[PDB]
């Protein structure tokens, strides 16, 4: 046969893969965490978006920290041999390196570790995408006028906000990040490589959104998503 290039992930397996969406809206009173109004819009937007990308979507709502860990562990034990990739979307409260279950914290590292190259062999060499809509701290952006492979390889963490910053969510339209991500995937998934789609998501969030709050401290704030890529190849959702 002719010259062959290995610069893009093989996305023509019988199945695209699983898309696990963990949607935490209601938290136990004991935690003191507020309800995340608008997150259901995000969950629905994501379900439709990934359905059109041919992913086997599994929506999970209001999971405890124990349920999140159990779910991810079970999913990592499945046979992903016929799947091209794996996607996990986390919608909840959070801190740097932490995502909140309805009853408490879950170390993000604990979740992702289940899918490490040496722990989930059927996903070795395949893109493992983690889309995270959650705060990464308490800072506000005021803006400005106008042989072997690493076990950590092939992971992509699409964070909604910069490290150490709050992440914004509109109670009616959903989070700024998820709204933008779904819109860009809808328009460009059959045309652009994933990093280029995420770059347009960064531009959309950075330019089209600004907070409105009755509290001056939280008013007129901005947000820039953070793409963290350990991917080793170009990722196109389409093939042929």
């Amino acid at each position: 046969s002719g010259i062959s290039l290995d610069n893009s992930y093989k996305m023509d397996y019988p199945e695209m893969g699983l898309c696990i969406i963990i949607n935490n809206k209601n938290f136990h009173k004991s935690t003191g965490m507020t309800s995340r109004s608008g997150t259901d819009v995000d969950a629905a937007n994501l379900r439709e978006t990934f359905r059109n990308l041919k992913y086997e979507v599994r929506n999970k709502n209001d999971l405890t920290r124990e349920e999140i860990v159990e779910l991810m562990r079970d999913v990592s034990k499945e046979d992903h041999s016929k799947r091209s990739s794996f996607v996990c979307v986390l919608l909840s409260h959070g801190e740097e390196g932490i995502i909140f279950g309805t009853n408490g914290p879950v170390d993000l590292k604990k979740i992702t570790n289940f899918f490490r190259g040496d722990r989930c062999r059927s996903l070795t060499g395949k893109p493992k995408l983690f889309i995270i809509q959650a705060c990464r701290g308490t800072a506000l952006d005021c803006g400005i006028e106008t042989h072997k492979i690493p076990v950590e390889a092939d992971f992509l963490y699409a964070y909604s906000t910069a490290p150490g910053y709050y992440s914004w969510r509109n109670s009616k339209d959903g989070s700024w990040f998820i709204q933008s991500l779904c819109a860009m995937l809808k328009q460009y998934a059959d045309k652009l490589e994933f990093m280029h789609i995420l770059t347009r998501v960064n531009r959309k969030v950075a330019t089209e959104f600004e907070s409105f709050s009755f509290d001056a401290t939280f008013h007129a704030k901005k947000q820039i998503p953070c793409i963290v890529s350990m991917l080793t190849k170009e990722l196109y959702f389409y093939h042929h």
């Binding site: 507020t34 995340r36 109004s37 608008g38 909840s92 409260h93 959070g94 809509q133 959650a134 705060c135 909604s160 709050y166 992440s167 914004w168 969510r169 509109n170 109670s171 989070s175 907070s211 409105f212 709050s213 939280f218």
Partner: peptide, 4 residues
């Protein structure tokens, strides 16, 4: 608008 609310924070997460």
């Amino acid at each position: 608008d609310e924070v997460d």
